[PDB]
Design an enzyme around this catalytic site. Structure first.
Site, PDB file in Angstrom:
ATOM      1  N   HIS A 103     -21.087 -48.663  -3.144  1.00  0.00           N
ATOM      2  CA  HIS A 103     -22.035 -49.703  -2.771  1.00  0.00           C
ATOM      3  C   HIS A 103     -21.870 -50.174  -1.319  1.00  0.00           C
ATOM      4  CE1 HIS A 103     -19.318 -53.226  -2.975  1.00  0.00           C
ATOM      5  NE2 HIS A 103     -18.952 -52.920  -4.207  1.00  0.00           N
ATOM      6  N   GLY A 155     -15.030 -59.600   0.534  1.00  0.00           N
ATOM      7  CA  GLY A 155     -14.306 -58.691   1.393  1.00  0.00           C
ATOM      8  C   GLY A 155     -13.201 -57.903   0.701  1.00  0.00           C
ATOM      9  N   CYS A 181     -13.527 -55.836  -1.867  1.00  0.00           N
ATOM     10  CA  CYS A 181     -13.934 -54.589  -2.511  1.00  0.00           C
ATOM     11  C   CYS A 181     -13.201 -53.411  -1.903  1.00  0.00           C
ATOM     12  CB  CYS A 181     -15.444 -54.365  -2.403  1.00  0.00           C
ATOM     13  SG  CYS A 181     -16.421 -55.562  -3.311  1.00  0.00           S
TER      14      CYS A 181
END
Ligand SMILES: O=C(O)c1cccc(-c2cccnc2)c1
Ligand code: NA
Lengths: 306, 304
Positions: free
Chosen positions: A41, A143, A145
């Protein structure tokens, strides 16, 4: 003496964390040999995330659309490709700090260490269990991920988790390192919810053995039970079924302490039915279920990772 | 979202852990630049545990009585000296993995990460707090002496603890990296007992603010309290006194959540009176005291 929730030393994984930027999105990547792994993503704008077509979004990106920083050194992306929900950025340099590693998929109830990171920079480490409902009760801010979860077996790092999203109840969802989600989740901004969670019975039993090993014994009693009898009580209190394989795994702890598993199950049945009566176990007023049998043995035997 | 007992990433300390052997005793050392720091009781024999004269035991050793092993490599000891209760071994190689670091002595209530090690190799990392009675509630087996505690705010490692011994209640005592023990303890096996321990009130308040930031308000109430009335109640539950310093330190969390510090104190007073009535706060059924105000701000969002 003492018993603490303990993570693996994180140094081997710290040397693999990089920053991945695509457009306005910065998150974390895992740099191993000459590939950087991160959530697919990363390529989505916010409207894309509403209903993404990942192959289509990826086709527009060139290698130079992926900025990858390892420390203060840019990496050059020379290829890109998708495996399930992870993006693989081929880079021109093998990571000289690549540890001995494997990708493994874990089972619900198993534990692992999370190296929480932001902008490719590690910021904290903590220990997690994969819940029966396939979420983890992590601590992550925007932040995070691409932060990863792992175990260390001897000198080999087994990577088992990459962070993708937070669910509305505040628990967390992610994939293994081959991009397969844990749980019935999708990487899309849509209505998703954790299912009803249950308690990991074999882990609670392991932690009761840890308590006994550490001198906490007030909950022991003279009684024993059967698997069939106990599992009826377990189901009533939203505990996972205890299997014969669970009993076998706890064999070592049963022999070390002199409390048979179904002896300890009778202890657990009484705690579920009557509570704790104002007392605590290993400093907890709740029954702890994020220590596996292996966790208890290893912490009560001092295994090391250098 | 979420709230977890969170340790610092240990890699910067892992690269400094070595094994120190003297005689038949092996424990851990901390290798920074060209110096290896370790507990001075590595030079004791079973003869010496009750009243060792460390000056007399040390003067009898030469550099080559100390074996220091970094991984599979023997470092050469080229000098030794003692500073309070730590031994400093000068070695003939500076550690190429030495991080930016400093040594800091901490105060009760402060938290830090512990890198538990055995034979110079790291086992695990967890979070600890220095109790008001100057002990820590650690996880340490035989052979863990010389394991260190540390923080890493801003890529510099602040070393604040070296593990020396386990007290009879199962809690742990140690020194700062200048070798000064925390609390009244001494590196002798003469009978020593930790003072009665108490709850770190300012940390409990911080953790209650953490719960509000993460969206939980069930424990608040419509009341306030004076600081002195709060202390008169909280010490009846073995809570540490809350000072004006503590009130000031909680200012930022108060501003973020909109709950005045003394209003949060009133909520704590009622929690002590009522218990949780089956509920939990940030996943715990007890009031947690090993998160400092600084920890909460570092882990939590700033939005609530
Ligand atoms: O200050 C000392 O030298 C000393 C000597 C003997 C015992 C203790 C001691 C230290 C801590 C707790 N109980 C006893 C201190
Ligand atoms: Na029993």
């Amino acid at each position: 003496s003492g018993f603490r929730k303990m993570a693996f030393p994180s140094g081997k994984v710290e040397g693999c964390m990089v920053q991945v930027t695509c457009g306005t999105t910065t998150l974390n990547g895992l740099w191993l040999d000459d590939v950087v792994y991160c959530p697919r993503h990363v390529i989505c704008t916010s409207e894309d995330m509403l209903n993404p077509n990942y192959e289509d979004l990826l086709i527009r990106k060139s290698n130079h659309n992926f900025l990858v920083q390892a420390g203060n050194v840019q990496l050059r992306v020379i290829g890109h490709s998708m495996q399930n929900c992870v993006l693989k950025l081929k880079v021109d340099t093998a990571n000289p700090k690549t540890p001995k590693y494997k990708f493994v998929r874990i089972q619900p109830g198993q534990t692992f260490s999370v190296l929480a990171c932001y902008n490719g920079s590690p910021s904290g480490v903590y220990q997690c269990a994969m819940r029966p409902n396939f979420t983890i009760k992590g601590s992550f801010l925007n932040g995070s991920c691409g932060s990863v979860g792992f175990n260390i077996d001897y000198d080999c790092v087994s990577f088992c988790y990459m962070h993708h999203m937070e669910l509305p109840t505040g628990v967390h969802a992610g994939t293994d390192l081959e991009g397969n989600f844990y749980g019935p989740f999708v990487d899309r901004q849509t209505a998703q919810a954790a299912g009803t969670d249950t308690t990991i019975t074999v882990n609670v039993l392991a932690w009761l053995y840890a308590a006994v090993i550490n001198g906490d014994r007030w909950f022991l009693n003279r009684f024993t039970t059967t698997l069939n009898d106990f599992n009826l009580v377990a189901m009533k209190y939203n505990y996972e079924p205890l299997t014969q394989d669970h009993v076998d795994i706890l064999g070592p702890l049963s022999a070390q302490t002199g409390i048979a598993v179904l002896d300890m199950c009778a202890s657990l049945k009484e705690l579920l039915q009557n509570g704790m009566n104002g007392r605590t176990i290993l400093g907890s007023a709740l029954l702890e279920d994020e220590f596996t049998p292996f966790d208890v043995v290893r912490q009560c035997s001092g295994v090391t990772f250098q």
